[PDB]
Amino acid sequence: ATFEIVNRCSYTVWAAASKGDAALDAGGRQLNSGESWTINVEPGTNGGKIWARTDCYFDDSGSGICKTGDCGGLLRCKRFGRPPTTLAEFSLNQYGKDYIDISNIKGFNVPMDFSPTTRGCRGVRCAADIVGQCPAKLKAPGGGCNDACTVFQTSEYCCTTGKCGPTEYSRFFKRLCPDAFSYVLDKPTTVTCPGSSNYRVTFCPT
């Protein structure tokens, strides 16, 4: 499957793509404002994610640091990134269907649209100014708006027992971005698309 990753933000972002134990495609790249990066993701990929990283510095070897979404200091990510990260999440060719969503469970850093480029389902977006409106206790100094599980590390925010409810913090994310997951047991906002669809992820869609 083909994913086009487009940076519409006015600032540089370093896109990342991983399934947690491996890179997807090259795993990461710098995208200046307006640049597009096309990746191929193997059919059957379960648990893939794409995100943006902000304020990164990399040396000639591809080693460095980012202020949001750093994936163990690598340009080319093999693992998932440090919160806060708005996430585009997907599982492809699962019994004939693809499943896509956006998640704020690991916080928010960059606004995002995640849409198919082929026929037969709708896209999802979270484009509100979550960083601007972020509760004081969730604000990340490096930039971004952390989720409450990252900040407070309780069973309730992290839904460790498999039983948890919405919280004042989850409801914040949910109010600004209804179509994204706000906590682990949120009512699913997953979209079912035809198997083998193609997609575009747009940073700063509006």
Method used to solve the structure = X-ray
What span, in angstroms and rounded, lies between the C-alpha atoms of 173 and 182? 6
φ/ψ bin of 184: left (φ > 0), alpha (ψ from -120 to 50), beta (otherwise) = alpha
Give how far Cα 123 sits from Cα of 40, 97, 153, Å.
Answer: 19, 15, 32
Q: What is the resolution of this structure in A?
A: 1.5
> Please, what CATH class does the domain formed by 1-206 belong to?
mainly beta
Q: At a CB cut-off of 8 Å and minimum separation 6, what does 170 contact?
A: 148, 157, 182, 183, 186
Q: DSSP letter at 120? A: S
Spatial distance between the Cα atoms of 199 and 52, rounded to a whole number of angstroms: 16
Contact 41/53 with Cβ under 8 angstroms? no
How big is the CA angle at 193 (ends 13 and 79), to the nearest 5 degrees? 40
